[PDB]
Curated annotation (Swiss-Prot), chain B:
Compartment list: Nucleus membrane; Nucleus, Nuclear pore complex
Transmembrane residue ranges: none
Recorded family membership: Belongs to the nucleoporin interacting component (NIC) family.
Biological source species: Xenopus laevis
The protein's role, per its UniProt record: Plays a role in the nuclear pore complex (NPC) assembly and/or maintenance.
Name by which UniProt lists this protein: Nuclear pore complex protein Nup93
Signal peptide boundaries: none
Amino acid sequence: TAADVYFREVSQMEIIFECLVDKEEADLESTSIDSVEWANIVVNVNTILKDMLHVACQYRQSKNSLYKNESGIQEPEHVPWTASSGTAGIRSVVTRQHGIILKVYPQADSGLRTILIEQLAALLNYLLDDYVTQLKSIDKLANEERYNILEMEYAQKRSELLSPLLILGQYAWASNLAEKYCDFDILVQICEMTDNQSRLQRYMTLFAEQNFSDFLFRWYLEKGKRGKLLSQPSQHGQLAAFLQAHSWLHELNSQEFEKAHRTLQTLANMETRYFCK
Amino acid sequence: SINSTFYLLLDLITFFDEYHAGHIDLSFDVIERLKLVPLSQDSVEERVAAFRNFSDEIRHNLSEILLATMNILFTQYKRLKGSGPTTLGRPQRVQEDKDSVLRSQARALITFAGMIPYRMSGDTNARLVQMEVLMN
Amino acid sequence: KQYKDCLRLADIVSSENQKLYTVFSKTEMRNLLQKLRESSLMLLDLQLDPLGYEIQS
Amino acid sequence: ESHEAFNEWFKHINSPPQKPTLVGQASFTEKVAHEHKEKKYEMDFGIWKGHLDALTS
């Protein structure tokens, strides 16, 4: 119907081509496994809103500043800088993205390859949202920090809501999501713990500064949650969980007899309730 | 029947010769080949069923076979523990795996000795359990 | 699965009435402490303390 | 007496009742025979466990 004025305001044609995927969705008749063609039209919109966010990102790699993203300038463009669009996190543009994620309701009833392409797609979109929050947080100055630390909790409770959503999804994408908001450890670390891949939690601590002082303090906070012997299923691995804990019972188990003696005596001294004990 | 019993008694004489000579690894290879006793928990029921088909001449020797086999396992376990850490180069995981295997073999022999419909001497059962307690 | 009574063997072996600690070799005493540690780990798997008392929450 | 009691206990602990296994294409008569074998096993296991606890004491 026109476009020159809907380009200065194209942001509005994304919050409404979502409300027209939902009123198309009301007539999608996707009650269970019957509907197919109608779960293909919800994906065709997901692809276009996605590659539109891909285009805003690569046009922020084609910078002109010789300080802001030197790559793409007089310096090698073989390594792009942060794939963020440096978007400021719009409260209607972000809401339509957290709306179309919760159209993860289709992956409940859908053929196996289709549920992966929309999952790689919703991963591709969320890795632009977490990138624009990261770029905006980086720009904050030291004073007014109270507003900066409250915006951090807001992004951290959304990387934490993008994670339960991908706790049912494929964890082959968790390695990528964890690197995309390049920390977000509490997801990847619980993915490495639900599986049999402590080759992954070793690979996670291998490529991380002071992973040792973190993994022990992450074990102790996760007392009875992660690092158990008994949650994992045969040999050395079961023994390792006991070792991680930093009482006299796990001390006898770890072969720390001198330590067990000190705590056993300390308990004996505080004991007043029962003579036999 | 008679012929199988005869060659099995000859192979058992070779087992006890290697055992009494102190050739612990050769005596272990012989008893593993003879399949008279279970060397895994999963083989216990199969060997208890097979025991019913042995002749009385073999059944009478079973107490000594179990004691000799348990002494072999206990001595291999002592060799594994007495090999102090001074060989810089054997991976510590391979040692823990071998300890776990010898304890599993020792448990299979006791489970077997308890399931057989043959009254072993009380001293035999006490020595088998004592050797396992010294391996735990 | 009487793991609490396994740990009471330490009190019996250390008792001055029978002086049982004098008849154990250094190797047997180490093996006893290892076996007691194994029973103490099984108490922790039962959500009890290392001595078989209820963990006061 | 302690060694005899231990040997009786050690014989009994190593002879647990066998849990009935259902073969994957059992006839209607074989399923009813399995339920009768399973009820028999629970009874035989209860008796075996009661005897084990007495021998343990």
